[PDB]
Amino acid sequence: MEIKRFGRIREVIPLPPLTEIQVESYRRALQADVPPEKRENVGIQAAFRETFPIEELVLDFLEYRLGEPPFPQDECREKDLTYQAPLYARLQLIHKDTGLIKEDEVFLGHIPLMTEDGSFIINGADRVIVSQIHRSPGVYFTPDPARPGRYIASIIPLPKRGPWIDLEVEPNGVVSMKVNKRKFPLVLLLRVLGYDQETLARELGAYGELVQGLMDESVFAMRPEEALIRLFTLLRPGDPPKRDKAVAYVYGLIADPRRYDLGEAGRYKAEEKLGIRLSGRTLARFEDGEFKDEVFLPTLRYLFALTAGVPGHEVDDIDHLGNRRIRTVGELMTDQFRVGLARLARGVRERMLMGSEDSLTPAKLVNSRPLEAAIREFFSRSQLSQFKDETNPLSSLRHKRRISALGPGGLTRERAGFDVRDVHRTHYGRICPVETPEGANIGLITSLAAYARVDELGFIRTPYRRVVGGVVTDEVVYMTATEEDRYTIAQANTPLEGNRIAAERVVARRKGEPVIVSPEEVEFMDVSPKQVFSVNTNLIPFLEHDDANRALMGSNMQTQAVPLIRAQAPVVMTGLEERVVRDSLAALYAEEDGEVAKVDGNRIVVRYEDGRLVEYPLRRFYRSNQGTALDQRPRVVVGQRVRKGDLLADGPASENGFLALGQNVLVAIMPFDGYNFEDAIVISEELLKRDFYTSIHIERYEIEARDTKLGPERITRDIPHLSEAALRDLDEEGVVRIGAEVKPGDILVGRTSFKGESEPTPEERLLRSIFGEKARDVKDTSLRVPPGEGGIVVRTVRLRRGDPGVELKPGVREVVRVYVAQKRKLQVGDKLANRHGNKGVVAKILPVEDMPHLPDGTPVDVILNPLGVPSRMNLGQILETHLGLAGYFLGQRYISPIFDGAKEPEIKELLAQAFEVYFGKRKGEGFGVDKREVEVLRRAEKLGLVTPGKTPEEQLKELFLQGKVVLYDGRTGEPIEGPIVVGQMFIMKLYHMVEDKMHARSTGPYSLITQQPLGGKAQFGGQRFGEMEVWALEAYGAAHTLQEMLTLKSDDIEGRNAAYEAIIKGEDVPEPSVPESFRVLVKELQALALDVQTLDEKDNPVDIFEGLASK
Amino acid sequence: RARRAKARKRLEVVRAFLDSGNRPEWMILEAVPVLPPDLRPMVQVDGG
DNA sequence: CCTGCATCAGAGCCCAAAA
DNA sequence: TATAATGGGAGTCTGATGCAGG
RNA sequence: GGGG
């Protein structure tokens, strides 16, 4: 069908590569494709250059190299291996005493490599590293809350690279310095820098009472060396103030370009703010034997000038996105790399003392264990390294562009308040105002705006078009927040004739504040409305019509859309759904021009102009982290002529290259018999019949056979006391055959384990003797099927020890994996949502004969209750339906861009053209207006919907332009007493499906210490009946019900055993006994040397252990 | 006022011990109790 | 006598919780 | 069981209460 | 990080 696009906005630049924030960050850190001599000092390179040379003997760093991966990406995922490259480093050993030089290339372990789409493979699982927002290093000045006329200057370096500093000015009048939460007079530190009373008086003095308050005579009564010793006694009480020891402490804390690192952004922000230029990233220097100041005096100078009200001095807003920067993958990994390198150096210095000061090379001197652990620690356990969200291609694309304020070096949950969670004015065009979690994390986790990119310093930049005179150039400038506030920025929709601003009054911003301005005053202009919102928000058509709280739900839920076998793109798109599939890397494109030689289910072979017969294998039914099927399908035919960049295969949840998160269904908006109540949804059985909303899902099962002190676990088809009916679908070896239907209780992999000293009790001995069957040496441990799961066995992997290429963790003979698939039809309790935030569970599936239908016999698909619209204020879904109605009959799909879209009149033109096909067909087919259509028209003119005094066709078209049609109830045949809104809507099936969530337990596993039921469905747990639930039972006064919850249904052991026996014998359950978790409480208080005594009414002790604990 | 206040707080601890029958030197441990083992278990998990 | 000032103990529920 | 070796490395915000101090 |  035809695709009609609305909107007048010409976007001068396309969206940037969307995963570039990941790819570019790590490529810059490793520089693997750069020749060593040409590397800039950044990332991995910078870490080596910082840690070396290592002093005593001197070990010096030459260069590093990265090898190729031992195994390819697919292979790593299979074998539970990390995708990584071997790292080597060339080191030269120098003897500071002798002259000796031994040089060798030492192996430092492996480093994980990033794939093409911006993710990692860590132990077989695909992972994402989330960027971290934090306060930029630099020098800031904030108002002191206590004294309304004074200020604090804070010098903050990069995280873990130095202390926080506070320069409060105390009530006594002297300027104080705060380091590691301890305070002293700042004048003392100034003298150590070699400052004299003259320098401070002549430099500053202009502020009469402030500069004199810093002056303290006792401090001046000593040369720079004595003042250094004096300060050290303040910071480290009890440590003897040896001159080399004091220098070492203060140097490492202040001047050392190893223990103190301002940022590269810190240097720029400091140089720019104080109007000085920094020679390095440290606050001071050690030069010609004494200390020479860099930062401290300019920072003191700015503070006094600010307190006095000198022009050009302002306080800094700490949530401004110019003073807040992003820490990307490379930077996070490099920080952990730097820690691991410094630890290895501890091993080097300590080994340069023990064992002979001569017979050592660099290869024996280096133990790489500290480095390997730090990198492995970061990737396998950091709280920024997350399990990839790959439910559908958009899930992972969004995951990679997220920004977290949490994690190692940032806010905690308990540690976080309003200023940080707010939407700052500088978020415009940089961080999406919509896409954030609802609940406790609101505002801490956000998403990168679509046109934003992170610069080399770590500040988020956004594009704007230059405007010279009144003419808008095509030159685009990416701006930081600090630089953006200088200019006057017009809105992207301001009218244009050609390249000229066509309005006499334009809508613009100056420092985020909205302002009306004449075309003479316009310096820049927005590139597009798209630049303000995240990628998910940009996928919501008619967004200009949706309340923000609901738009949020629309964004977040597209992440949760399950790939459907029949998946289709929405009939109303925003025009981004093409780009998302392409940047995600889910689909497949042609490298150069060529002709398709072969097309298969498994592969596509293309013959290019070059003559090379490139073969593209297709990924078929691979199981993602969330168990949705990632599978690619061929879109071309043998001999098809393709150009460069044309589609070859469609990925999951994509249709002919457009993002398909759901299906397009015909919807009626109307109550239906209370099956619509409070957001529930009623659907037509026609949807299951034609396999709409069916999705494939795969669950993975695994079992190990290991060596025990009692003998080997063996995976075998021979399992004690089981009938042949039970083993039928098992192969020779005890593994289920590929292509079998397995249901709950069925054996997947047979296994036997050797019986413990529980070697059968005499009760079992006599029973076994009666039947004349020896009690077997092994017991049945077979892997089976959990309650509620099962499907078709599609694959088996078996890995033993002593087979090529495989070695398991110690003690493990063999590992078997069984992949089981299921086709899931939509059912009652599965969850649906559209892009505007209407979400609900399927409560009823009616047979097609009950569904409301159009006069021409077509039944509707979904019935949504109108009560969900007005309080929610998400109207985009309404406009989406109307344009969807026209498209149903005209056979078209639309692109309506956000904020430059299809407007109401334009949709009306399209709706009228549809009516001709819905009606004109009928008038020609020899049918006139229906009797019931008149009855509804009667009711409609009482409503003011149609104008009185027109032919039925004239009135029906009037209703059709309001998006309403006559609807017949399939139960009665009578019309709905009014015209009903009907049209095509895009609705997705989300990841929350009852099959996954239904759970129940009679009795089951218990915890070790408490003897209470376990938690969670996978453990067959019991439900938690918590403090508030007990209150509920208490307020009702249901004491025996409550007592059951506290005893027989949990940790009362004598009672719960006895209660079960009663139910199976038909007796009533016994009165409960003492709960075991109370006995634990008693014994734990005894371990604290407290005597807890249960007493009777006579004040005599009562023994709740029934004699077992007393001698 | 302050003299009467502190003698009270002290007198409350004294009276606490007096009524209860507890000896103050019991706030000092000679024998340290050890909690039963099943309450601090060493268990073999699935993997051995 | 009274007031700064520190050290301490608080910060919702249930479910997945992908180790 | 024997050259001599002699002092360490490292990280929010609220309200209530019992304390050394103009 | 995700559901109400």
Ligand SMILES: Nc1nc2c(ncn2[C@@H]2O[C@H](COP(=O)(O)OP(=O)(O)OP(=O)(O)O)[C@@H](O)[C@H]2O)c(=O)[nH]1
């Ligand atoms: N205590 C608590 N409740 C939650 C949480 N998450 C979701 N809820 C529930 O979510 C529900 C929100 O329901 P709403 O749909 O906003 O109810 P409403 O007032 O009718 O709002 P509308 O439906 O838009 O009219 C509440 O009833 C909560 O019990 C949570 O994290 N904590």
